[PDB]
Scaffold this active site. Structure first.
Site, PDB file in Angstrom:
ATOM      1  N   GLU A 107       1.105   3.049   5.271  1.00 56.91           N
ATOM      2  CA  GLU A 107       2.163   2.889   6.273  1.00 56.91           C
ATOM      3  C   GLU A 107       1.638   2.553   7.680  1.00 56.91           C
ATOM      4  OE1 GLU A 107       6.049   3.835   5.217  1.00 56.91           O
ATOM      5  OE2 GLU A 107       5.708   1.997   6.391  1.00 56.91           O
ATOM      6  N   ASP A 113      11.025   1.096  15.347  1.00 55.11           N
ATOM      7  CA  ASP A 113      10.990   0.815  13.906  1.00 55.11           C
ATOM      8  C   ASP A 113      11.853  -0.433  13.547  1.00 55.11           C
ATOM      9  OD1 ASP A 113      12.782   3.941  13.383  1.00 55.11           O
ATOM     10  OD2 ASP A 113      13.714   1.979  13.228  1.00 55.11           O
ATOM     11  N   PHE A 126       8.685   7.954   1.287  1.00 49.71           N
ATOM     12  CA  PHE A 126       8.466   7.593   2.689  1.00 49.71           C
ATOM     13  C   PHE A 126       8.740   6.093   2.958  1.00 49.71           C
ATOM     14  CE2 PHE A 126       6.045  10.776   5.484  1.00 49.71           C
ATOM     15  CZ  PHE A 126       6.339  11.895   4.730  1.00 49.71           C
ATOM     16  N   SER A 148      10.726   4.361 -15.274  1.00 42.07           N
ATOM     17  CA  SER A 148       9.403   4.723 -14.759  1.00 42.07           C
ATOM     18  C   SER A 148       9.212   6.225 -14.614  1.00 42.07           C
ATOM     19  CB  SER A 148       9.151   4.053 -13.415  1.00 42.07           C
ATOM     20  OG  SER A 148       9.441   2.669 -13.481  1.00 42.07           O
ATOM     21  N   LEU A 198      10.681   9.768  13.156  1.00 40.69           N
ATOM     22  CA  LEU A 198      11.823   9.464  14.030  1.00 40.69           C
ATOM     23  C   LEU A 198      11.949  10.520  15.131  1.00 40.69           C
ATOM     24  CD1 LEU A 198      14.324   7.220  13.564  1.00 40.69           C
ATOM     25  CD2 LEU A 198      15.589   9.297  13.500  1.00 40.69           C
ATOM     26  N   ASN A 213       6.343  -0.726 -15.702  1.00 35.00           N
ATOM     27  CA  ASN A 213       7.714  -0.693 -15.178  1.00 35.00           C
ATOM     28  C   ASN A 213       7.767  -0.654 -13.656  1.00 35.00           C
ATOM     29  OD1 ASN A 213      10.318   0.173 -17.325  1.00 35.00           O
ATOM     30  ND2 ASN A 213       8.246   0.008 -18.145  1.00 35.00           N
TER      31      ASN A 213
END
Ligand SMILES: Cc1cc(F)c2[nH]c(=O)n(C3CCN(C4CCOCC4)CC3)c2c1
Ligand SMILES: CCCCCCCC/C=C/CCCCCCCC(=O)O
Ligand SMILES: CCCCCCCC/C=C\CCCCCCCC(=O)O
Ligand SMILES: CCCCCCCC/C=C\CCCCCCCC(=O)O
Ligand SMILES: CCCCCCCC/C=C\CCCCCCCC(=O)O
Ligand SMILES: CCCCCCCC/C=C\CCCCCCCC(=O)O
Ligand SMILES: CCCCCCCC/C=C\CCCCCCCC(=O)O
Length: 446
Positions: free
Chosen positions: A210, A219, A303, A316, A231, A331
């Site tokens: 990330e 963002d 996330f 999955s 946030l 998958n």
């Protein structure tokens, strides 16, 4: 005793007392003079330094005079009071170590729920109850045992605890003051170390995938964010984002924050993510079945996509809880997620496939000052209180086997815990070490 022995013992005990009173005063003044040391956990360190100051100034000096003079000359009332002050301060130190251990335990295991309650006011409440419980438990029995028995069995010119006469009661107090607190603190430490290294790996995983930002940024939705997708506010204001950041950290940051402060915010977001997973009926059975490494890969997906997004992988999730990792990997790769972030998705899918940190290349455990201090103060307690507690153990199976001299040295070793406790803070925390040096050089300067 000989005049040569009186001088030698008085010098050694005197220097030890001087090192204990100096070190704990330096520890207390450090938290007082430095604002960065004014943390909720350091309130318990100040409380522990208070108990160690009594041991250094009162207990140590008065017990040495008692050994050198070979008798107690202050009377039976001064004696029982002296013993009460001694035992309550010694137990208050053990209670404070338990407070440091539990606070460190709940702040690492529960960074979201516990930090709502982690205010200085609640630290002061826990400190006072710890000192009050130490008092209520030991002082009434020290002073009133003679009245319950019906006689004071301690002779005039003698000063010692009357209820600790029988070795089984001495063992009973040893279980409550050493064996049970040590077991509890060790079990707490194994959990703190396992949690710290587990959370670190999630932090380093998301730092690669990330990205970590030390300064306030906008963002994709346009809201002010910091660190790894944390946030601050949905309000269209930079100062409102700054006010919400200063509230979360506790200092005037003004846009920029450190990696460790960003890690603190990230761990609250991990707790918020795990709260959602367990409250989601489609993600709860798979999360409970996965190991620590594979759980982090699921949290990584939460996330990025969100709660409902990961829940979309019905096929999955079913193969991951069935431990058919090669099947679920096929998958997961055949999705819009893999096409949008191929490098991140492959790393996460490989994590589910292998169940190891081979996709990321991870560093060893970064043992933070707080973790190192806890281990040092716990080992300090085990090291200094073990001789006396072994003497208590051999006392139960061996009647009058332990000599007067050994008990005196075992008692003195327990007091050494008060001398080495501020040394543990100085050796583990750079902010304490520098402040100790700063205050000492300032005292020498007239
Ligand atoms: C000040 C003072 C004065 C005295 F005349 C004393 N006589 C005596 O036996 N002691 C003990 C010294 C050691 N302390 C320990 C016991 C284990 O837990 C930590 C504290 C218990 C009392 C005296 C102490
Ligand atoms: C209520 C808190 C308990 C403290 C009160 C106990 C009284 C302690 C008195 C200390 C006075 C110091 C005198 C030093 C000489 C010691 C001689 C001896 O007794 O061997
Ligand atoms: C005979 C003397 C006994 C005195 C023991 C008193 C009990 C100790 C109480 C705790 C001290 C308060 C700790 C908190 C201080 C906060 C420090 C700060 O950040 O300013
Ligand atoms: C809260 C602070 C209270 C501390 C005050 C200390 C006062 C101690 C005074 C001396 C007590 C001596 C009384 C005589 C006892 C009998 C002596 C003996 O057994 O030989
Ligand atoms: C007769 C023996 C005398 C020994 C006196 C010292 C023992 C301490 C006793 C208990 C007091 C409890 C402390 C509470 C103060 C609150 C401090 C805080 O948390 O801010
Ligand atoms: C362990 C810490 C040593 C420091 C304190 C001095 C204790 C000395 C007491 C032993 C003397 C025995 C005796 O009475 O002959
Ligand atoms: C820093 C380390 C210095 C240590 C100082 C303490 C020394 C005390 C050592 C023990 C000497 C033994 C005293 C003799 C007591 C005889 C009693 C008996 O015969 O049972």
């Amino acid at each position: 005793m000989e005049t040569v022995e009186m001088v030698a013992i008085a010098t050694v005990a005197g220097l030890l007392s001087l090192a204990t009173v100096t070190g704990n005063i330096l520890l207390m003044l450090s938290i007082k003079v430095n604002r960065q040391l004014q943390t909720v956990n350091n309130y318990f360190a100040f409380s522990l330094a208070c108990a160690d100051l009594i041991i250094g100034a009162f207990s140590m000096n008065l017990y040495t005079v008692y050994i050198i003079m070979g008798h107690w000359a202050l009377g039976a009332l001064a004696c029982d009071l002296a013993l009460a002050l001694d035992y309550v301060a010694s137990n208050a130190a053990v209670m404070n170590l338990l407070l440091i251990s539990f606070d460190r335990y709940f702040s690492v295991t529960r960074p979201l729920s516990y930090r709502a309650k982690r205010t200085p006011r609640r630290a002061l409440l826990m400190i006072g109850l710890a000192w009050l419980v130490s008092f209520v438990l030991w002082a009434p029995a020290i002073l009133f045992w003679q009245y319950l028995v019906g006689e004071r069995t301690v002779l005039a010119g003698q000063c010692y605890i009357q209820f600790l006469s029988q070795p089984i009661i001495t063992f009973g107090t040893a279980m409550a003051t050493f064996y049970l607190p040590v077991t509890v603190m060790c079990t707490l430490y194994w959990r703190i170390y396992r949690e710290t290294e587990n959370r670190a790996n999630i932090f380093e995983m998301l730092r690669i995938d990330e990205g970590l930002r030390l300064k306030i940024y906008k963002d994709t939705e346009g809201y002010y964010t910091i660190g790894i997708g944390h946030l601050l506010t949905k309000s269209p204001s930079l100062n409102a984002a700054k006010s919400e950041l200063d509230k979360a950290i506790g200092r005037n940051t003004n846009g920029v924050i450190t990696k460790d402060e960003a890690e603190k915010l990230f761990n609250q977001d991990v707790d918020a993510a795990v709260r959602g997973i367990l409250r989601n009926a489609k993600l709860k059975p798979v999360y409970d079945s996965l190991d620590a490494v594979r759980r982090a890969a699921l949290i990584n997906m939460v996330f990025q996509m969100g709660e409902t997004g990961v829940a979309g992988f019905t096929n999955s999730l079913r193969m991951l809880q069935q431990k058919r990792w090669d099947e679920a990997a096929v998958n997961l790769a055949k999705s819009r997620w893999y096409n949008q972030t191929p490098n991140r998705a492959k790393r996460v899918i490989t994590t589910f496939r292998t169940g190891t940190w081979d996709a990321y290349t991870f560093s060893l455990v970064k043992e933070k000052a707080a973790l190192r201090t806890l281990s040092a103060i716990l080992l300090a307690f085990i090291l200094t209180w073990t001789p006396y507690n072994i003497m208590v153990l051999v006392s139960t199976f061996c009647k009058d086997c332990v000599p007067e001299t050994l008990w005196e040295l075992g008692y003195w070793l327990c007091y050494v815990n008060a001398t080495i406790n501020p040394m543990c803070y100085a050796l583990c925390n750079k902010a304490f070490r520098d402040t100790f040096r700063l205050l000492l050089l300032a005292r020498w300067d007239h």
